[PDB]
Amino acid sequence: MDIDPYKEFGATVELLSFLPSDFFPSVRDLLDTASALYREALESPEHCSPHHTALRQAILCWGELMTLATWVGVNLEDPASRDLVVSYVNTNMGLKFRQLLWFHISCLTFGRETVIEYLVSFGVWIRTPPAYRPPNAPILSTLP
Amino acid sequence: MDIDPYKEFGATVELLSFLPSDFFPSVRDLLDTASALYREALESPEHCSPHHTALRQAILCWGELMTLATWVGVNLEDPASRDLVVSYVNTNMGLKFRQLLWFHISCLTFGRETVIEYLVSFGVWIRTPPAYRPPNAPILSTLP
Amino acid sequence: MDIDPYKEFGATVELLSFLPSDFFPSVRDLLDTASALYREALESPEHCSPHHTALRQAILCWGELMTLATWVGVNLEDPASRDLVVSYVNTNMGLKFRQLLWFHISCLTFGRETVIEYLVSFGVWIRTPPAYRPPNAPILSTLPET
Amino acid sequence: MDIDPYKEFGATVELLSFLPSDFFPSVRDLLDTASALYREALESPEHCSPHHTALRQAILCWGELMTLATWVGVNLEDPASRDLVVSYVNTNMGLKFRQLLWFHISCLTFGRETVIEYLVSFGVWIRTPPAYRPPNAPILSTL
Amino acid sequence: MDIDPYKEFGATVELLSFLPSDFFPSVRDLLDTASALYREALESPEHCSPHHTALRQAILCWGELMTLATWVGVNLEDPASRDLVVSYVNTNMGLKFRQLLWFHISCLTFGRETVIEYLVSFGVWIRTPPAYRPPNAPILSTL
Amino acid sequence: MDIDPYKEFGATVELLSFLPSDFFPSVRDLLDTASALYREALESPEHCSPHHTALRQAILCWGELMTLATWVGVNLEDPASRDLVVSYVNTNMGLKFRQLLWFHISCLTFGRETVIEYLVSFGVWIRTPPAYRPPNAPILSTLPET
């Protein structure tokens, strides 16, 4: 099996792997934004859009990892391996979760084509020397 | 946040929690069946159906848990906590994964309404005393 | 005040008395069925039918007895008395509770006319000696004609 | 299963919490009024309103509860246990029966909206300080 | 900036000066009635009337005031100061809250013109000499 | 009782929480702005819009706290207690007062949709690391299309 999580939405792992790994925001901010903007539609009994299904699945899965961390924070005596597993869970899967949440939340708000164009724009802007690029980096916005 | 993984497809956690916990098949059989029957459509660049997106997400997530188990099978010295975490990962999340995979694979093949009717049928059939129920339990099939 | 639970629904008590005592499912199975199949409709602020209203009163009449069962545990300092009370409440009233729930849920799930026909047919089967009786009793299901 | 006894009739336990428990009449009076005003209807072969179904089921539950006292009277071998259970049954489980009977008799006699408005108005009377509260409490009438 | 709390609803502080301060009910009753009659509407995602906006803002201000007592309880190091401020907050600033809550609940229940007429009529009753004043004060009803 | 000030106006608290604490003007500047721009409309006997009614309650809720500030001065004979009370009242409640006034006055002066769009856009700018962030933050203004 080879399931690419971005192949049905028109992107790839390489494209999202184009931008540096520190450009994505924290998990808490993403969850706050999602709850603030789309909770109603995320909890309805409707196939609102293909993005809603993916977001629901991802949040449901993250809940189980959180419960696992809480359980292993009690059931396990040794604090050495406990800390190691906690850090692993909060870093390795956290990066992927951050990328997926960022992509889906941005595509719901600004539209998928705009996000796919912005990826290419920022990737090129960040690699050309500074003296020959515009001083202001691109940013997603709605007001003119 | 309250995301029910079955609310957009017309079911609930209670309904799927109606049938006993031992009725679902193993993970390996489900993966074999999925690979045999729908790999082509699962790997295309198309929003084939809302079920394909959920299956892709679930398989992608299960891959990370498998990689985590492999990593902790080496990086961790103590075999006591290692075994505990391995068993936890292979049981607690395994049950949920089995339920979700069974539901989606059955709904792709036989249709969602048929699976929702079969749930109710089997749940009632299993609770009435034996002397007053038909000796043959219901089963999903295609041939007459 | 002579009141019969099944008279406004087209049935009677003598019709329902033919069924054997071991025919009915246990209370926990009936509660699980009712929950899983009608939680949303049983909590709505809307009238749905006489069956829903009839069930919404029996469920609460049983819950208060369930609380009474626990109450006597920490007030009555006599194992014999508490055991007798608990067993009486859990058998004598439990049988009627099961019988009522089964009838209402079967009217909900299969239609009322089908339930009445099934009862009429089961009576005949149960009233004949086993020697001349077919080994298998009737089963409840629906028919295309309605 | 989180079921409200009045959710389907346009009220809730919150609204009925306005009235004190010393306001409802005894069981005997409530049963007498029902037997004098609606016996034939309650013994009919069909349903007339959701109120009739509710009253029928409540009266059946109360009768099944009353048989329990008679049983314990002759099957229990201890006086303290033969009295504690009877007192509990006749005092703690009679309050809810009184409230339900009052609500369902009043809704059949005067009308549902009238009962809702009567509760809303009694709340205002009971909330007022004594120095300004009238001496006559609101009452239900159908003249 | 010379703003009247009731200038936009057809009344003034002059009219509300007819009623004595011993006539209004306690805070608990007023909050209970609101929670029992208008909770869902007050938690809605849109405005229904100017009364809902006023009630929302007043309840928020009251809650922010209530947190102050809890804070002073654990951050003040003196008993006299830990009591004087609490007494002030709970006695001097509760009167206005009671008046506003009474006005806004009564206008939603019975209607604005009814409240204005009720105030005008209560003035006449309170102004009369005792030797001729009736024993029953006017009351608001919706039967 | 869960009540949110900005829910009937199309916004939320999490949306407004992104703005930094030093973004808002001081209380005296907001009061001067409100006076100079809407004294007549805020004293009229007519309903004008939900914004005017919302402001007319907050102004009085703040004035009584302002009076309370003075009252404790001539009753509490303890510099520490009075200073703690005054500072708490003038900071903790002052921040919320400023945040509410700014939002309502900005909805009055620029239109509500513009305010919501500006908040949505400012969040994105503030959520990115400074290294990849343009030096200048967005500014609030109106556009011909409406």
Side-chain angles (χ1 to χ4, degrees):
Chain A
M1 275 292 189
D2 166 63
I3 318 305
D4 184 1
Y6 305 103
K7 179 160 185 57
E8 57 156 354
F9 296 100
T12 50
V13 174
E14 295 302 320
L15 189 44
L16 177 63
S17 189
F18 201 104
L19 275 66
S21 58
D22 289 345
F23 181 79
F24 298 86
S26 62
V27 175
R28 293 182 183 174
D29 285 4
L30 299 171
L31 294 180
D32 298 355
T33 311
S35 57
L37 292 183
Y38 302 98
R39 172 146 77 75
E40 294 207 333
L42 282 175
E43 298 178 325
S44 298
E46 302 181 21
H47 298 146
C48 199
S49 64
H51 298 287
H52 288 74
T53 317
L55 276 174
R56 293 173 202 181
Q57 290 287 5
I59 298 169
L60 295 174
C61 188
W62 184 247
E64 295 302 320
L65 296 176
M66 197 53 49
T67 59
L68 177 63
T70 291
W71 175 89
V72 74
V74 174
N75 183 263
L76 205 68
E77 293 177 350
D78 73 312
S81 193
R82 172 166 52 179
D83 302 359
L84 291 169
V85 297
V86 170
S87 62
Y88 182 88
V89 170
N90 281 322
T91 301
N92 301 79
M93 302 184 180
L95 178 59
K96 305 157 178 290
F97 181 74
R98 292 158 61 184
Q99 290 189 41
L100 177 63
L101 177 63
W102 179 90
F103 182 82
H104 279 304
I105 303 301
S106 292
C107 285
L108 275 66
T109 304
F110 302 98
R112 291 193 297 274
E113 289 288 9
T114 59
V115 188
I116 285 171
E117 183 178 2
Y118 171 80
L119 289 170
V120 175
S121 292
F122 189 82
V124 172
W125 182 94
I126 204 175
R127 277 164 175 84
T128 48
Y132 306 89
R133 71 197 193 191
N136 294 126
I139 195 175
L140 295 169
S141 66
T142 299
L143 295 174
Chain B
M1 275 292 189
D2 166 63
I3 318 305
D4 184 1
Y6 305 103
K7 179 160 185 57
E8 57 156 354
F9 296 100
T12 50
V13 174
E14 295 302 320
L15 189 44
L16 177 63
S17 189
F18 201 104
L19 275 66
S21 58
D22 289 345
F23 181 79
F24 298 86
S26 62
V27 175
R28 293 182 183 174
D29 285 4
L30 299 171
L31 294 180
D32 298 355
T33 311
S35 57
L37 292 183
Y38 302 98
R39 172 146 77 75
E40 294 207 333
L42 282 175
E43 298 178 325
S44 298
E46 302 181 21
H47 298 146
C48 199
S49 64
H51 298 287
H52 288 74
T53 317
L55 276 174
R56 293 173 202 181
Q57 290 287 5
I59 298 169
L60 295 174
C61 188
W62 184 247
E64 295 302 320
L65 296 176
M66 197 53 49
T67 59
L68 177 63
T70 291
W71 175 89
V72 74
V74 174
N75 183 263
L76 205 68
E77 293 177 350
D78 73 312
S81 193
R82 172 166 52 179
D83 302 359
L84 291 169
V85 297
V86 170
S87 62
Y88 182 88
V89 170
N90 281 322
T91 301
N92 301 79
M93 302 184 180
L95 178 59
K96 305 157 178 290
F97 181 74
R98 292 158 61 184
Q99 290 189 41
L100 177 63
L101 177 63
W102 179 90
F103 182 82
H104 279 304
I105 303 301
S106 292
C107 285
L108 275 66
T109 304
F110 302 98
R112 291 193 297 274
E113 289 288 9
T114 59
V115 188
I116 285 171
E117 183 178 2
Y118 171 80
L119 289 170
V120 175
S121 292
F122 189 82
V124 172
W125 182 94
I126 204 175
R127 277 164 175 84
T128 48
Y132 306 89
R133 71 197 193 191
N136 294 126
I139 195 175
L140 295 169
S141 66
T142 299
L143 295 174
Chain C
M1 276 288 199
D2 278 332
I3 297 172
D4 183 4
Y6 315 107
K7 183 190 183 69
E8 63 185 342
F9 300 97
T12 189
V13 179
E14 322 308 344
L15 185 62
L16 271 296
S17 61
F18 285 130
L19 297 173
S21 295
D22 289 345
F23 176 90
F24 299 101
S26 56
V27 176
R28 293 182 183 174
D29 302 7
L30 297 180
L31 292 172
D32 285 329
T33 298
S35 304
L37 266 61
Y38 300 102
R39 182 197 287 270
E40 320 302 2
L42 291 175
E43 296 176 337
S44 176
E46 306 168 338
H47 294 307
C48 287
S49 58
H51 300 292
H52 290 279
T53 306
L55 290 167
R56 276 183 258 192
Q57 306 293 344
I59 289 176
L60 297 182
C61 168
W62 172 258
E64 294 166 4
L65 293 170
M66 186 52 50
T67 300
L68 188 147
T70 73
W71 182 82
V72 307
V74 192
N75 280 273
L76 307 194
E77 304 165 355
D78 183 87
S81 300
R82 67 172 194 163
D83 295 1
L84 294 165
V85 171
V86 173
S87 300
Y88 179 89
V89 173
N90 201 275
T91 186
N92 288 77
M93 307 181 176
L95 189 142
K96 294 183 173 182
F97 184 65
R98 296 158 59 188
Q99 182 179 338
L100 184 71
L101 279 180
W102 176 88
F103 178 88
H104 278 300
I105 287 171
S106 297
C107 285
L108 265 178
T109 310
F110 293 108
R112 196 167 47 78
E113 295 288 358
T114 308
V115 174
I116 294 169
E117 299 163 5
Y118 172 78
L119 293 175
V120 168
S121 290
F122 190 88
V124 178
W125 185 90
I126 186 167
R127 279 198 302 272
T128 61
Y132 311 139
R133 185 194 303 172
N136 282 26
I139 301 89
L140 179 56
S141 301
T142 179
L143 285 298
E145 53 183 339
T146 181
Chain D
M1 304 182 187
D2 187 4
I3 305 183
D4 289 345
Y6 318 103
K7 184 65 62 176
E8 58 181 326
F9 296 101
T12 56
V13 182
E14 293 177 350
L15 283 80
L16 275 66
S17 300
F18 294 171
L19 311 190
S21 59
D22 289 345
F23 163 90
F24 306 91
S26 56
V27 167
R28 189 65 272 171
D29 289 345
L30 296 170
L31 288 174
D32 296 352
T33 56
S35 64
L37 294 169
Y38 306 104
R39 186 174 183 175
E40 311 300 351
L42 292 176
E43 298 182 8
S44 72
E46 325 292 339
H47 61 78
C48 295
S49 64
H51 296 290
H52 292 81
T53 310
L55 286 181
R56 291 161 181 159
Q57 294 300 320
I59 297 164
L60 294 171
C61 182
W62 178 249
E64 299 296 351
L65 295 174
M66 280 290 294
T67 294
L68 176 62
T70 301
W71 186 86
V72 296
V74 185
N75 279 120
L76 275 66
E77 293 177 350
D78 191 305
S81 301
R82 186 176 187 272
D83 292 351
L84 287 168
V85 182
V86 171
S87 287
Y88 179 92
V89 170
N90 276 269
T91 199
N92 192 31
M93 308 183 75
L95 177 63
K96 293 179 179 179
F97 188 63
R98 287 156 64 195
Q99 295 186 235
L100 184 141
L101 257 182
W102 178 80
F103 187 86
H104 281 316
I105 294 171
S106 300
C107 275
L108 272 176
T109 305
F110 303 91
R112 204 184 79 266
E113 321 310 339
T114 304
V115 182
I116 305 305
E117 298 164 1
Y118 179 79
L119 297 164
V120 172
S121 296
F122 192 98
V124 179
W125 183 90
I126 191 66
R127 286 196 343 272
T128 305
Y132 305 81
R133 182 182 65 198
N136 47 325
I139 199 174
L140 271 165
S141 174
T142 178
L143 283 156
Chain E
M1 304 182 187
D2 187 4
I3 305 183
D4 289 345
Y6 318 103
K7 184 65 62 176
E8 58 181 326
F9 296 101
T12 56
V13 182
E14 293 177 350
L15 283 80
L16 275 66
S17 300
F18 294 171
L19 311 190
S21 59
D22 289 345
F23 163 90
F24 306 91
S26 56
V27 167
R28 189 65 272 171
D29 289 345
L30 296 170
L31 288 174
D32 296 352
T33 56
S35 64
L37 294 169
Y38 306 104
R39 186 174 183 175
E40 311 300 351
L42 292 176
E43 298 182 8
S44 72
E46 325 292 339
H47 61 78
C48 295
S49 64
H51 296 290
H52 292 81
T53 310
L55 286 181
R56 291 161 181 159
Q57 294 300 320
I59 297 164
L60 294 171
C61 182
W62 178 249
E64 299 296 351
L65 295 174
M66 280 290 294
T67 294
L68 176 62
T70 301
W71 186 86
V72 296
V74 185
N75 279 120
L76 275 66
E77 293 177 350
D78 191 305
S81 301
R82 186 176 187 272
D83 292 351
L84 287 168
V85 182
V86 171
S87 287
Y88 179 92
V89 170
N90 276 269
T91 199
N92 192 31
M93 308 183 75
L95 177 63
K96 293 179 179 179
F97 188 63
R98 287 156 64 195
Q99 295 186 235
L100 184 141
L101 257 182
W102 178 80
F103 187 86
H104 281 316
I105 294 171
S106 300
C107 275
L108 272 176
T109 305
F110 303 91
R112 204 184 79 266
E113 321 310 339
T114 304
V115 182
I116 305 305
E117 298 164 1
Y118 179 79
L119 297 164
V120 172
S121 296
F122 192 98
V124 179
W125 183 90
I126 191 66
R127 286 196 343 272
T128 305
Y132 305 81
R133 182 182 65 198
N136 47 325
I139 199 174
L140 271 165
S141 174
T142 178
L143 283 156
Chain F
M1 276 288 199
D2 278 332
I3 297 172
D4 183 4
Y6 315 107
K7 183 190 183 69
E8 63 185 342
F9 300 97
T12 189
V13 179
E14 322 308 344
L15 185 62
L16 271 296
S17 61
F18 285 130
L19 297 173
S21 295
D22 289 345
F23 176 90
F24 299 101
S26 56
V27 176
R28 293 182 183 174
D29 302 7
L30 297 180
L31 292 172
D32 285 329
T33 298
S35 304
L37 266 61
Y38 300 102
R39 182 197 287 270
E40 320 302 2
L42 291 176
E43 296 176 337
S44 176
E46 306 168 338
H47 294 307
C48 287
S49 58
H51 300 292
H52 290 279
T53 306
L55 290 167
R56 276 183 258 192
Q57 306 293 344
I59 289 176
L60 297 182
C61 168
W62 172 258
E64 294 166 4
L65 293 170
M66 186 52 50
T67 300
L68 188 147
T70 73
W71 182 82
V72 307
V74 192
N75 280 273
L76 307 194
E77 304 165 355
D78 183 87
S81 300
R82 67 172 194 163
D83 295 1
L84 294 165
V85 171
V86 173
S87 300
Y88 179 89
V89 173
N90 201 275
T91 186
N92 288 77
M93 307 181 176
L95 189 142
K96 294 183 173 182
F97 184 65
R98 296 158 59 188
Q99 182 179 338
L100 184 71
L101 279 180
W102 176 88
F103 178 88
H104 278 300
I105 287 171
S106 297
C107 285
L108 265 178
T109 310
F110 293 108
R112 196 167 47 78
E113 295 288 358
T114 308
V115 174
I116 294 169
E117 299 163 5
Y118 172 78
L119 293 175
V120 168
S121 290
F122 190 88
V124 178
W125 185 90
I126 186 167
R127 279 198 302 272
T128 61
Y132 311 139
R133 185 194 303 172
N136 282 26
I139 301 89
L140 179 56
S141 301
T142 179
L143 285 298
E145 53 183 339
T146 181

